[PDB]
Every structure is written in C-alpha cells, then in structure tokens.
C-alpha cells in the first residue's frame, strides 16, 4: 500500500534537523518541496520529488 504514507500532511519539526524535503499534498495532489525537521514527522516524506510522484501517484 502507498496511500498510507500519502495521507499525513507535511510538518516542520522542532527537533535536531533542518533540511529541504518533499511531501504529497492531499489538497492539490502534487509533490511540494517542504522543510523537514529531521525527526520522523508523520510519515509522508520523500527525498526527491520524482519518487514522491512515483510512489503516491505512479
């Protein structure tokens, strides 16, 4: 199943981590490059935009 991870909204995370990331928006259905706080947020996270699409959509 893929829809699982592709359900939780992106987050910031006030942990020890500050880098660019990607997530799937259930509002539009496109991969938006957000900021990851490093610590495991919810579950909807991706290293690259492509994968995010080839994992949520394709």
Swiss-Prot record:
One of its GO terms (cellular component) is nematocyst. GO terms for molecular function: ion channel regulator activity; serine-type endopeptidase inhibitor activity; toxin activity. Thermostable. Complete trypsin inhibition at all temperature ranges (25-100 degrees Celsius). The record marks 16-17 as: Reactive bond for trypsin. Keywords: Cleavage on pair of basic residues, Disulfide bond, Ion channel impairing toxin, Nematocyst, Protease inhibitor, Secreted, Serine protease inhibitor, Signal, Toxin. The record marks 47 as: Important for the stabilization when complexed with trypsin. Its main location: secreted. Residues 6-56 form the BPTI/Kunitz inhibitor domain. It is found in: Secreted; Nematocyst. The keyword Heme does not apply. The keyword Cell division does not apply. Disulfide bonds join 6-56, 15-39, 31-52. Belongs to the venom Kunitz-type family. Sea anemone type 2 potassium channel toxin subfamily. Negative results: does not show activity on all potassium channel tested (Kv1.1/KCNA1, Kv1.2/KCNA2, Kv1.3/KCNA3, Kv1.4/KCNA4, Kv1.5/KCNA5, Kv1.6/KCNA8, Shaker IR, and Kv11.1/KCNH2/ERG1). Serine protease inhibitor that also shows protective effect in a cytotoxicity model. It binds to all proteases tested (trypsin (Ki=52 nM), alpha-chymotrypsin, cathepsin G, kallikrein, and human neutrophil elastase). It significantly increases neuroblastoma cell viability in an in vitro neurotoxicity model, being a consequence of an effective decrease of reactive oxygen species (ROS) level in the cells. It also seems to protect cells by inhibiting ATP-induced purinoceptor (P2RX7) activation. This is PI-stichotoxin-Hcr2i. It comes from Radianthus crispa. The lineage of its organism: Eukaryota, Metazoa, Cnidaria, Anthozoa, Hexacorallia.
